[PDB]
């Protein structure tokens, strides 16, 4: 299941393998058919969520349309259960981008120092995204440090 998750992540990160949707749809159908005759769905869901975290917390423009196809296929294969957690994670991504819009509005208001130049700050919830280890700590840039401090004050 881990290798299947890696394969689906490789197919989802970019549509280089087949620009047209036809072959993408066929290969996704074949992948879900292969997943149908598979056990140990818990590790599959865990690794799929980890791949979602990796692909959403990095450069975007992954597909901006195939996420709906992926969630629909999950809802018709596993059903509202493990796919429900991924729906919650997508809702949390929406929350983060709305909070980023709010922080941009706050920077347009203050707009005085160089603390928040292009501070693209994402706000996530503990439950959806597991801790990397124990939230590491070390010296950070001071202008952006005061930017993060003002974001925390907001």
């Amino acid at each position: 299941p881990e290798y299947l998750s890696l394969f689906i992540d490789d197919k989802l990160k970019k549509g280089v393998k087949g620009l047209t949707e036809q072959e993408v749809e066929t290969i996704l159908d074949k992948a879900m058919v292969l997943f149908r005759f598979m056990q140990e769905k818990d590790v599959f869901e865990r690794y799929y969520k980890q791949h979602l975290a990796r692909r959403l917390l990095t450069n975007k423009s992954v597909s901006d349309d195939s996420e709906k196809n992926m969630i629909s296929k999950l809802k018709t294969e596993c059903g509202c259960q493990f796919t429900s957690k991924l729906e919650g994670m997508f809702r949390d991504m929406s929350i983060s981008n709305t909070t980023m819009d709010e922080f941009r509005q706050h920077l347009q208001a203050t707009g005085v120092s160089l603390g928040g130049v292009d501070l693209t700050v994402r706000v996530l919830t503990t439950g959806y995204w597991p801790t990397q280890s124990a939230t590491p700590k070390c010296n950070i840039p001071p202008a952006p440090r005061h930017a993060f401090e003002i974001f925390r004050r907001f």
Partner: protein, 89 residues
């Protein structure tokens, strides 16, 4: 200077007022067992006494809110349907 930072893409994680020092259900802590377990061993017999995280970013002992599900069904510090999004700290 030679290197200057222009853009930053930090990700901020948030947690509600779970009161890590007082469990909002049993008032012991966010760890170190609960009222109905007390002693560390207390005839553990496997099972578990870890922390339970909900969809509302609230944290209590698994035992505390597992028992509390029989008294009510909405997280006491709010009015949201309690989920079980995580297990353990």
């Amino acid at each position: 200077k030679r290197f200057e930072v222009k853009k930053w893409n930090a990700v901020a994680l948030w947690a509600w007022d779970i009161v890590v020092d007082n469990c909002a259900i049993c008032r012991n802590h966010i760890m170190d067992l609960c009222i109905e377990c007390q002693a560390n061993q207390a005839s553990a017999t496997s099972e578990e006494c870890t922390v339970a995280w909900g969809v509302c970013n609230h944290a209590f002992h698994f035992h505390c809110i597992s028992r509390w599900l029989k008294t009510r069904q909405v997280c006491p510090l709010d009015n949201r349907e309690w989920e079980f999004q995580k297990y353990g700290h």
